[PDB]
Structure formats: structure tokens, C-alpha cells
Amino acid sequence: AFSAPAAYLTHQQKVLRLYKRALRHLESWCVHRDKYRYFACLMRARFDEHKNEKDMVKATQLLRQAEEEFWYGQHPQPYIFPESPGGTSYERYECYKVPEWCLDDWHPSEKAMYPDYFAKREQWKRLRRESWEREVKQLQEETPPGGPRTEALPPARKEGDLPPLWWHIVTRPRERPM
Amino acid sequence: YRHSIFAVTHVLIPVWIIHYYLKYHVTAKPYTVVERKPRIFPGDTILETGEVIPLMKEFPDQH
Amino acid sequence: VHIEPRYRQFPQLTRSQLIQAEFFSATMWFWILWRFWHDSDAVLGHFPYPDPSQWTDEELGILPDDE
Amino acid sequence: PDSWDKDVYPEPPRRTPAPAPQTSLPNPVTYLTKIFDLLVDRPVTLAREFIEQQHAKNRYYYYHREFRRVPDITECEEKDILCMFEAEMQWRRDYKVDQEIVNIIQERLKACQQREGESYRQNCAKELEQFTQVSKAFQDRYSDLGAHYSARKCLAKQKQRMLAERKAAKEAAA
Amino acid sequence: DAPPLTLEAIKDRVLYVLKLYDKIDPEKLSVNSHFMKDLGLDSLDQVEIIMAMEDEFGFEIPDIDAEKLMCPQEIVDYIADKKDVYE
Amino acid sequence: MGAHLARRYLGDASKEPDPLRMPTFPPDYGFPERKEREMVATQQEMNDAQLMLQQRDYCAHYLIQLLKCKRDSFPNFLACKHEQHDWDYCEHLDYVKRMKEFERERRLLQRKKRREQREAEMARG
Amino acid sequence: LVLINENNPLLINSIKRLLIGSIFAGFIISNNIPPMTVPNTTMPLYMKMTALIVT
Amino acid sequence: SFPKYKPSRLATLPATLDPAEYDISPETRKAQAERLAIRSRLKREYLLQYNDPNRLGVIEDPALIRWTYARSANIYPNFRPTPKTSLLGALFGIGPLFFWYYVFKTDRDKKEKLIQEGKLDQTFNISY
Amino acid sequence: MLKIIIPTTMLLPMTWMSKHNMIWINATVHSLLISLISLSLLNQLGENSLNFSLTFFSDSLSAPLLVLTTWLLPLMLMASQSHLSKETTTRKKLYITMLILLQLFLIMTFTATELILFYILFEATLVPTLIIITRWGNQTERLNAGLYFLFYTLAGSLPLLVALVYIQNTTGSLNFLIIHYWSHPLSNSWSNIFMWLACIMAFMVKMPLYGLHLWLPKAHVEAPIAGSMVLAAVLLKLGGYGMMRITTILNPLTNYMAYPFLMLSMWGMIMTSSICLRQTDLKSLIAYSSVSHMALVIVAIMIQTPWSFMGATALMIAHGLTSSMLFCLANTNYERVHSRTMILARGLQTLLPLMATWWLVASLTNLALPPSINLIGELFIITASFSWSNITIILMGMNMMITALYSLYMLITTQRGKYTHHINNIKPSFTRENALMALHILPLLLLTLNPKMILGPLY
Amino acid sequence: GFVAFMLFMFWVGEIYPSYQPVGPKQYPYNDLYLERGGDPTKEPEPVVHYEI
Ligand SMILES: CCCCCCCCCCCCCCCCCC(=O)OC[C@H](COP(=O)([O-])OCC[N+](C)(C)C)OC(=O)CCCCCCCCCCCCCCCCC
Ligand SMILES: CCCCCCCC/C=C\CCCCCCCC(=O)OC[C@H](COP(=O)(O)OCCN)OC(=O)CCCCCCC/C=C/CCCCCCCC
Ligand SMILES: CCCCCCCC/C=C\CCCCCCCC(=O)O[C@H](COC(=O)CCCCCCC/C=C/CCCCCCCC)COP(=O)(O)OCCN
Ligand SMILES: *P(=O)(O)OCC(C)(C)[C@H](O)C(=O)NCCC(=O)NCCSC(=O)CCCCCCCCCCCCC
């Protein structure tokens, strides 16, 4: 989620993703650790047996057949980590995530209840407001005339600068906000 | 102390209020509180009229 | 009570929970045995099941075929 | 309290069997009843005594309004608005009284069923017949007259029913 | 309820898993040991290492980010950033 | 569950009895002298005890005795074992009488079948 | 990372209270209610233990 | 070897089983690059607006505005009474009405005939 | 009724002579006082109505509507305070004058004793509403909405005027008491069919009826908040009141002419609920829900049984209050984000808890949660329809299911989920808005406590 | 297939019910004529049960 996607997935990426999916579904089928280790070793033996293949057409055909085999033999109810998409704990804490722009609508009494925090918050706000022009200038200098070709952002070249478009990434709510 | 102060208010005041409401307002109107009549068995004593409900026949022994 | 987490090791148990679990399992089995000793009829039946084939035509009121 | 008419709201005599214990164990129900009498019944009785003493200090009365009888829509002439108005008001009051009579009979039936309990299908069959008669008469009188019912519409329905009955009687004994 | 993670604990656990891997020599293993440049592994081994880390820490690393974690330090940084660990 | 279901559904349903229509033969058919069942508990007694209509069978007096025993010795609910056993035995006797009725119907039907087959044989030759 | 810990008094007491009621409640309830149905006293032996056999 | 998966409207074909996912031409790569470029341009514009410190309000979405306008205010000008539209409108707007009219008329005629014949159980029906 | 009529005609000069910064305070305070005064009309008799004079009379059907109007005026004033901050003093006074005139016309319409005066006032209510919509609406479609509203109403109501003057010439008087006592059956001929059509079609276009209802979404979406509040809560009930009044002289022909309108109303309930299922605009959803509820009221009035009129009155009052509350909530959300798209703003339960509570309560009242008067009216109508025929139960059941579906759908879409990241102008809810929602919701629960006051004259 | 098979087997079991080899349950007083709501004025057809 933190990395900009590419235009397409290469053959190596396709086969690696298929290998990971097959291992995860095999672990779902093979509940016990020793049995899972045995069959995962067999699966990697198959992958290594097909590893060396100069013919890309034959490699693609093998990949297609392997994908068909995986879809036929997949676990109907595969194991999913609780926080992963589709998991039992996915998006559970999204209702507790409140942003700093909500935080600056507080009453003066509430703000006075937390004196030291808001001084640092004001420092952060000044730091944000003193860098936006440099960030936009750096972004517009490094773009091609046609426009961006990828969703990757440049870092900060100078010592006193900050990586452009950093505010929300840095100040995103914690994974357990409450 | 906490359980005593919780038991007087939360239990003793509602029961007083409800008993007062039932005994003098709900039961002041007909048919508001209807009780299924008690079961009368043979060989019993009706307390209201001082009556005696007699026993049944002599059971034929079944072993 | 404070329980320190363990890494790749069997967790730290407690004498109180051990004895309570054993006591309640023993209580369940004792109750089952005590009830079966006194109320075995509730599981094994109480009255015999009659065999219809052993009933006589005289007591069932079935006349001979000639009538 | 018993500030209602026993004849209007009948109730069979209450037969409570006497307690005849066959065991030496104490009765938790009896002990809890004693506790309830000591803790609740006596304080509420004292409070009610005080309140009723305060009520008797100044005692005043209210009356039941009596309505005179007026000529009805049968005696009213056609297009006689005053007589029609009086007859309509009288008919509406009678309609409300009949509704409350039906309510009284239904209350009798419900109370009898609950009281009899497990043997209601036989014991409370006298209330069922009275309710059947009252319901049939009420339906025949104030049947489907609509949302704009009136004394004239009820009179028209009664005339139609009388004509039907007369025709049936004639075709039977003719 | 559960004790919070720390950078040192995350590094210790990932190095523990890597030292339990049989294709890595524990004596030459460090936090900056590249899996392919100086450890002599390949894509399947890197995928298996990522899956082992997922099993160890009880969460899934997306394949878009998993293909770039070529160092134990990189794995530590990714886990700390995802779990919001700053100390 | 039982062999009677198999006999009726995979055999001669005419010879097997019909539970919803039996008894078919007269009660005195084959019984020169048969005694009417006796009811101990009266209608008024059952009504006062408020027995359920399904419980007002010929075994109602034992049920009334059991209820009276249970009510009197309330705190000690482990008391009326004798009354419970008497009621259960009365119900058992009622059930075995029902089984006797079913068996009588079955063998009367099969005897009728034998008689009519013999009559058919006589008529044929 | 083994974080197993069930030594909380609230959890233990709640499960314990619902545990005594999973052993000694059916007996009390069935022995303290009046008979609202006629029992099935007579039945074949193989039908009396049908539930146990299938279980 | 294995049974084949047959896609449906509500059971669409997975991306790993799509035959076109394995027959890639150099033009397909160009199309994918163009799509990525468009997405990157839109993302850059949105991120600039989103990270602007002086912005206070809602970033208007032209795509959302177009969707809402097309679904509500753009239907009638682009409507032509073709035979398909005429038949579908007539059916879905008239057929249910006559169906329910026939059903209710039949039911009420049966009830009225029973009432007139005096063979309908109307006892205890004093609330209408 | 002059004790209520005159204080409104005194609200007018008070509004025009008050200071520039005191107009809202004075109008709200005196509107609340007038509502308190109008609460006395709930003391109705059991047999005949309250005949104050030869011109005005009050009935068990008129009294709850008058109380609802007098209570609804100050809430509209509060909403106008909300959305008219930058207007000039004269234009604000003109807006308040329009609201006051509309309330006065509604009061006189509900208390009129003759059909021709009722028609005159019921048509007089068009001018203030049209002016309000086409003058203080926010978008371009307000002119088209005003045209559609005005012409639908007039095309409906002109044959009603012709029928009314014909009836007066034929019978002698249009006084309601006289036409009720001197009522005679209507024969089944073409002339009687067309007179029935004139009257009923006028009130059905006002109601509205399915197929004659597009003006309702057009006007309610494009009207300002006060206009939407008065259009949905009170102005829709003029048709129901008229039908409950005009059907006295249309029997027994109503037993034969009701089939097309009954089928239209039931299938319209179904169709409008299904439309509510897939609406991208919140105000359109609320408007179509209003259409469905009014169709149910139409069914009750057309079946015309004593159990159906009580349900009709209760449902009218409950729907008025619920629709006003829903429109107020939608207007608050709109004023926060300046857009009526429903999926634009989400996470509003995370951002505004109390407004989430108000949304939950309003949506629960909309789907007829017992023992609310919404459910009381709907259940009475359903029972009467079941007595009428035994497939209306099927239609009502599916309508109720879809109603719950779309109510909870709009609740979940607006309040639940992840908040929109780029919307950073969600300020905390104002005390004015919270008080507006509370004043909308509390009378509903109080009427639930005491339901006999809104069950009409057939109670 | 599952739902259709279940419905078909339910119909088959309805037309081939399961029961026990016993006679009808016997009740006293004309099969409890008065207890079930019979008219006291009318006299029911007698129902007599005999021992066996
Ligand atoms: C008479 C003196 C006896 C010795 C001292 C007893 C304690 C002192 C207090 C007096 C108690 C008097 C007896 C009461 C019952 C005691 C237990 C008993 O007999 O059990 C029998 C039975 C047990 O008998 P059993 O059936 O198990 O016996 C079997 C016997 N064998 C095996 C030999 C055949 O238990 C019960 O009935 C259960 C009682 C449950 C009570 C639950 C708590 C109630 C809490 C009430 C709170 C509210 C109070 C206020 C209400 C009013 C509003 C304010
Ligand atoms: C005819 C004989 C049978 C009649 C039915 C008997 C039912 C017996 C039900 C339990 C007996 C009553 C026990 C009273 C418990 C309530 C007492 C109380 O209020 O709290 C005291 C005390 C402490 O409570 P805390 O939450 O820890 O508060 C701490 C304060 N610092 O309560 C207890 O925990 C007592 C421990 C209970 C032992 C477990 C009992 C399990 C009972 C199982 C069957 C109960 C089923 C319920 C009714 C059955 C019939 C429907
Ligand atoms: C025998 C069992 C019937 C079971 C019914 C099952 C449902 C099928 C009926 C509804 C399906 C739709 C049929 C009507 C919709 C018209 C179809 C259509 O759109 O065809 C047009 C062209 O128009 C036609 O072809 C007309 C052919 C069908 C005409 C049917 C007779 C017309 C009926 C006249 C009455 C209309 C009013 C009905 C309601 C009146 C009130 C009850 C072009 O089609 P395309 O989508 O562009 O191409 C797709 C090719 N597969
Ligand atoms: P790393 O970077 O070292 O490079 C390895 C790869 C594979 C990328 C090679 O560089 C490479 O591309 N080699 C040539 C291409 C090739 O190997 N193609 C064929 C490989 S796919 C294949 O052979 C898979 C077949 C076996 C696995 C099938 C999966 C089916 C099982 C599903 C089970 C699910 C439930 C149990």
C-alpha cells in the first residue's frame, strides 16, 4: 500500500505471487505444521523444476496451466490474517480515527486542558506552512512536460527541505487511535 | 455501605412505588389484576368457607 | 496477578486455575456417576416392552378360523 | 378497593385451599411473604393512611351528567335541520354507550378465561354466549355504515333489514 | 493489553527467524545483509522469508511491498512503520 | 419406527391396520363378555385439579395424587417418587392396552383375509 | 509470542457461574415443574437409546 | 485435466484465468502505460489540492458531478421513443396496474357474492 | 378562531417594525406563544365539532393540523436564521412575511366552514410558496420547480371550483354541516362520475397521487429549507383533509370509482420505495418517502372505513413531523458541505456524534418503529386494508420492508463508514441545530404517550 | 437439486408417515365431550371403551 504500482506485472512478479498464493492455500489445506512443511517443500520442488526455462512462450503456458490448477484446487475458505482485507478484524478501528483538522475545532477550555501538546502542534503547523512553496516548486521542476507518468514522489534534495506532499502521510492516524 | 445505599434506593423505592400503585390504583378498577384460581385437589380444605373437598374413590390396586 | 509473556515457550499457569479446572471436571463426573447410580431408569428404561407375538388369541378375542 | 358494581362485573367466589404441609422443611415462600409484609406492605399502608386522612380534610363531589330524551330521526321531518341535529346527537351518544357495553362484555370474557385457566373451554361458556349475542346485535345495528355514518344511514339499514325479514316471513308462510 | 513492540524487539525477532533459516549462515548474518547480493538467495527464498516474517508477526505484507524488502533492516523498518513503532 | 411400517408399506396394506381408522370391527366381535373401562376421577375433580385436556385420561387419579403430593411437600422436590412411579405404571398399562388393541386389529384383519380367500376358493371350486 | 492469560477474576467467575448451571440446572428445573404432558413410559429399548447411539 | 470455470454476470472471470492476460502485444503495453499516466496525472492533481495548507473546504470532483448530472438531469434530453422503450414503458407501467385490478376485483366479487348468499363467517367482525 | 387568527396579523406589523437584529428573536418568541395559545383547540367534543361562528369551526381533524402548523412556524424561522445570514434586512423581513402569510392562510384553510372559502384559501397558499421557492432557492431548477408546482396544482383545482359552484347551485349551500346533514346518495351516471372525478382529482393532485407527483421532487429538492419544511409537513395534508371532508357527498359512487386510485396508490408505494432504494440525492430520497406515505394515506381515505380515517390522521401528523426533521438534518449536512450528493460526505457519526443520534432517531421514526404514531397510523391503515381485501396485506408488507431498507440505507451511507479525507470544514454542531432537532423529535414521543389526540373525529 | 430433493422427500414422508403399533388414545366421558366445549343441552352419541 506504501509503494506506487507499476504499469504491469512482469513474469517474475506473476510467478512469485502465484507461488505465495499457492503456499498460503496449501497451508490452509494442510493445517498441521509438519504436513504443511512436507507439501510446501514439494511445491517449491515443482517450482524449482520449472525454474530454468529459456522459452518464454512455454513459461507463460506453464504459468497459465498452474493458475488454472490453483483455481480448481484452491481452498474455499482460505486462512486470512485478522487485520488483512476480508479478515475478521479488518477495518475494525476505522471508526476511532479522528484527524488533526477535527482536533483544531476544539474549544479554548479543551485546548487549555492540554497545554503542552498544542504548542508542539503549532510548531508542526508552522513547519508545514513554511515548506509548501518549496514542495510545489520541486514538484513542478521535476515533472516531464506531458505530466507525471507514475505515482512516485521525489525526495527532498536540499538539506533544509522536506519530501513534497508529506503532511498527511506523516500525520495519519495511529493504527490503534484509541 | 455502597451495597446498602444501592439496595435501599434502587430496590426498596421501586417496590414501594409499585406496591402502592397496584394496591390502590390498579386494583381499584375491575378485572385489572386477574389471578388464575388455585387448583383444588380431593381431600382438601377450602379456607374461605371452611369447606372440606372430599377424597376420591378407592383405587383398584395395580401393583 | 501479573503474567509475563513467553516467547516460543509454554505459558505460565496458575495453581488456582489448575485446581479449579480439575475440581469442576471432577464435580461433573461425580454428578454423572451419582445420577446414574440412582436414576439408571432414565437412561435404560423402566418398564418392559411387551412382545405382541406372545399374546394369545383367547386374551385378544380372536376366534378360531372355522367360525 | 372495591368501588365498582359486583353485578356489572361478576366474579365467582374464591376458594383457596388451606396449607397442609407434609415435610419438616421451612417454607421460603412463607418467610419471603413475611419479609415483604414487614418491609413494603406496612410502609405503603401507612403512607396511604396519611394520604386518605389528608383527602378527608376537604371532601368535594362531582356528578354524572344526565341527558334528556329527545325525538329521534324517525319522528324528524325531512329537511328539518334542528330536529335532525338533535336526533343525530342522541344517536351518537347511544352509539358510544353501546360501544362501551360491548367493551364491558369483552372484559368479562377475558377475565373469565384468565380466571378459569386450564379449563376455560367449558367453564367460561356462559360469557361466550352473552358475548356472541351482544356482538351479533351490535353488528346488526352498527354494521358497515362507513366512516360517514349517521342516524339516517342507520335508519335506512334498519328499514332494509325489516323489509328483508318481512319478505322472508311472507315467502315462508305463504 | 498486549505489550507494545519496540525497534529492538522487532530486530531481535526478525534476526531470530533469519538465524533459524537453514540457508543463511548465522555467523555472517547482520541487519544489512542483502538476501541476494551477499547472502546468495533468490526470489523464492525471499518470498519464503517474507512469509516467515508474516507468520512471526501475525500480519500480512502486501506483495507490492514484499518484493522490495531485501534487508533485515528494511523488514524492521517496514514492520515498525506499519505498527507505528517510534522507539 | 418398527417392522409394522415395513409390513404395511412394502407388503399387504389391506392386512396391516390403519392407525387413523381403527378400530374397525365391533368391540364385542370375538369377546363374549367384555368389561367397560372404569374411571376413578370424576369430571368435577379433574376440573378442580385443572388437569390439561390431554392429561384427563383414565390415569388421571394418579396424576391428581402426584400433584397434591408435590404441592404439599414443596421445598423437598425429591419426595413424590412413589406417586411418580404409580402414575408412570398406570400410563404404561394404558399403553400396553393400546398395543393389545392394535395387535387384535391386525390379526382380525388377517383372519378376515384368510376367511375371504377361503370363500373365494370355495366359490371357484 | 505467547500472550495466553485467563487468570482474570471476572472471566473466571462468569464462566464458573455459567458452568454450575450447565450441570445442576436441568435436574432442578425438571424436578421443580408440574407435569404438563403425559410421559412416554413404554418404548422399545433400541428407541430409548437412539439419541446415545447416534451421538 | 481440471473442470473449467465458467464466468457469469454475478460470478465474473478472475484476472488470473483471463486468456487475454497471457497474450500480450507491444501495443497492449503502450495502452497500459497510457492508463498509468492518466491515473498518475489525476493522482498528482488530487494530492496537490489535498496537501495544500490554505485549502479549507471540499475538493470538487468533476467525475462525481458528471455522474450525478447524467443519472438525474441528462436522461430526458437523450430519450427517443424507440419501440423498445415504448414496449418496456407500457409493460412496466400498465401491466402491474391491470394485474392488481383484476386480482382485487376478483377477490372482492367473490367476497361480495358470498356475503349476498349469506355463507361467509362474519361473526365477531365488529371492527371494519 | 379569531384569538389565533389576529396574533398572526399582528406578527406581520411586529416583524416589519422590529429592529434589524431583533426580527428573528421577536418572530420566534411570538410564534411559540401563538402555538401555545393554539394548543387549546385540542379540547374537542365527542359528538359534534366546535362551531365558533358562521365562518370558522374546529373539529378533531382540524385541531391537530392547526397545532402542527403553529408549531412548525418557529422551526422554519430557525432554519431561515440558519441559511439567511447575509441577506438584507428588507429581504429577511419579506421572507418572514411570506412565512407568516402562509401560516395564516393554512390556519384559515383548516378552520374554514364552507367549501368555497376552503378552496379560496387552499389556492391562496400557492402564492407565498411559489414566491419563496422561486426567489430564495439556491439552484437554477427553482424556476422550473415553481412552474411545475403551480400548474399541477391549478390544473387539478380549477375543475374543483367548477364542481363546487355547480354543487351550490344544485343543493343550496356549501356549508359543511348542511351538506353533511342534507347529504343524499350519488347516482351512478356519467355526470356524477365526472363531478366525482373533478373533486377527487383536484385533491389527489394536491396529495399527490402516483403519476401526478413529479412536481413534488422538483419543488422539494429546489426549495429552501423553510419551503421544504412547509411543503412536506402541512401543504401535502391539504389534499388529505379535503378528501376526508369532500367524500361526504360522493357516496356511494366512491365505492365504484376508488379502484383505479387504490391500485395507483399501492403500486406507487412500491415504485417510490424502490426509487428511494437507488437515489443519489438525499432530498430526493426524503421526497419520494413522503410520496409513499401520502399514497398510503390515499389508500386509507379511499377505502373509507372508521379504522382507516384514524390511521390516516395519525399517519399524516407523524409523517409531517418526521419529514420536517429529515429535511432539517439533510439541510444541516448540505450547509456543511454545499452539496446534496449523499455519498460525498461519510463518517458523520465519527465527526458529529449528536447529529448521528438525531439521524438514528429520525430514521427509526421513518420506518415506523413501535409504538410511534407512524406505526400506529400505518397499522390501522393496514388492518382496514386487510378487512377490505387480503392481498393488500402482501402489498403493505413489501412496502414496509422496502421502507426499512431505504431508511437504514440512507442512515448507513450518511453516518457510518470512513470519513471523507478531503472534507475538512465539518464544524461542531450548533446549539441552534441541536435544539431544532430536539423540538422536532420530542412532540412525536409525547404524542406516542397520548395518541387519542391525533386519531381524528372517529375515535 | 438440494431444495427440490428435500421437498420431494418431505412429501414422500408425508404420504408414508411413521407411527407406533398402538391404538387410538382413549378418553372418558364421551371422549371428554363436555370438557372440549360440547353443548350441555344436546346428548352426544355415546363412546364406550372396553378393557382388553
Ligand atoms: C427455620 C430455621 C432454619 C435454620 C436457619 C436458616 C437460615 C436463617 C433464615 C431463615 C430461613 C428460613 C427458611 C428459608 C429457606 C431456607 C432454604 C431451604 O429450606 O431450602 C429448601 C430447598 C432445598 O431442599 P431440597 O429439595 O434440596 O432438599 C432435598 C432433601 N433430601 C435430599 C434429603 C431429600 O431450597 C430451596 O427451596 C431454594 C431456595 C432458594 C432461595 C434463593 C434466594 C432468595 C433471595 C430473596 C431476596 C429477596 C428477599 C426479600 C423479598 C421481599 C422484598 C423486599
Ligand atoms: C426449589 C429449589 C430451587 C429453586 C431455584 C434455585 C435457583 C438458585 C440460583 C442461585 C441461588 C441464588 C444465589 C444468589 C446469587 C446473587 C447474590 C448477589 O447478588 O451477589 C452475591 C454473590 C457475589 O456476586 P458478585 O457479582 O461477585 O458481587 C461482588 C460484590 N462485591 O453472588 C454470587 O456470585 C454467588 C455465587 C453463585 C453460585 C453459582 C450458582 C449457579 C446457579 C445455577 C442455576 C441457577 C439458574 C437460575 C434459576 C434456575 C431456575 C430457572
Ligand atoms: C410464453 C411465456 C412468456 C413468459 C414471459 C417471460 C418474460 C418475457 C416477456 C417480457 C420480455 C420483454 C418483451 C417486451 C420488450 C420488447 C423487446 C425489445 O426491446 O425488442 C426490441 C424490438 O421490438 C420487438 O422486437 C418487439 C417484439 C416483441 C413484441 C411483443 C408483442 C407486443 C405486445 C403489445 C402489447 C404492449 C402493451 C403490453 C401491456 C399492456 C397492458 C397489459 C429491440 O430489442 P433489442 O434489445 O434491441 O435486441 C435484442 C435481441 N434479443
Ligand atoms: P527468482 O527471482 O529467483 O526467479 C524465479 C523465476 C520463477 C521468476 C524465474 O526467474 C523464471 O521466470 N523462470 C522461467 C519462467 C518459469 O519458471 N515459468 C514456470 C513457473 S510457474 C510453474 O511452473 C508453476 C507450476 C507448479 C505450481 C502450480 C500451482 C498449483 C497448486 C495450487 C494449489 C493450491 C491449493 C493447494
Structural notes for this entry:
This is part of a larger assembly, with ten protein chains of ten kinds. Chain A has eight helices and no strands. Chain A is mostly helical. By secondary structure, chain F is mainly α. In chain F, α3 packs antiparallel against α4. The longest helix of chain F is centred in the last third of the chain and has 44 residues. Chain H has 128 residues and is an all-alpha fold. Chain H contains three helices and no strands. At the D-H interface, α4 of D face loops of H. Bound molecules: 1,2-diacyl-SN-glycero-3-phosphocholine, 1,2-dioleoyl-sn-glycero-3-phosphoethanolamine (PEE) (2 copies) and ligand ZMP. The ligand *P(=O)(O)OCC(C)(C)[C@H](O)C(=O)NCCC(=O)NCCSC(=O)CCCCCCCCCCCCC sits at the interface of chains A and E. Chain D: This is NADH dehydrogenase [ubiquinone] 1 beta subcomplex subunit 10.
Secondary-structure map with pairings?
The structure is cut from a larger assembly and holds 10 protein chains of 10 kinds.
Chain B: H1 2-26, E1 44-46, E2 51-53
Antiparallel strand pairs in B: 1-2
Chain I: H1 2-17, H2 23-38, E1 50-51, E2 57-58, H3 62-83, H4 89-111, H5 115-124, H6 126-136, H7 142-171, H8 176-181, H9 190-206, H10 215-222, H11 225-235, H12 237-246, H13 254-277, H14 282-303, H15 306-337, H16 348-351, H17 353-366, H18 373-388, H19 392-415, H20 431-449
Antiparallel strand pairs in I: 1-2
Helix pairs in contact in I: 1-2, 1-4, 2-3, 3-4, 3-11, 3-15, 3-20, 4-5, 4-6, 5-7, 6-7, 7-9, 7-10, 9-12, 10-11, 10-14, 11-15, 12-14, 13-14, 13-19, 14-15, 14-18, 15-17, 15-18, 15-20, 17-19, 17-20
Chain J: H1 2-15, H2 28-32
The structure holds 1,2-diacyl-SN-glycero-3-phosphocholine, 1,2-dioleoyl-sn-glycero-3-phosphoethanolamine (2 copies) and the ligand *P(=O)(O)OCC(C)(C)[C@H](O)C(=O)NCCC(=O)NCCSC(=O)CCCCCCCCCCCCC.
Ligand ZMP sits between chains A (11-12, 15, 22, 25-26, 29, 46-47, 50-51, 53, 59, 62-63, 66, 69-70, 73-74) and E (42-44).
Provide a count of the helices of chain F: 4
- For the report, how would you describe the main beta sheet of chain D? none
End-to-end CA span of chain D = 60 Å
Proportion of beta-strand residues of chain D? under 5%
Computed structural class of chain D? mainly alpha
Care to count the β-strands of chain F?
Answer: 0
Classify the secondary structure makeup of chain F into a structural class.
mainly alpha
Give the count of helical stretches of chain D: 5
Largest sheet of chain F: none
Global shape of chain D: flat
Structural Rg of chain F: 21 Å
Gap between N and C termini of chain F: 42 Å
Oligomeric organization of the protein chains: part of a larger assembly
Radius of gyration of chain D: 27 Å
Provide the helix percentage of chain D: 55-70%
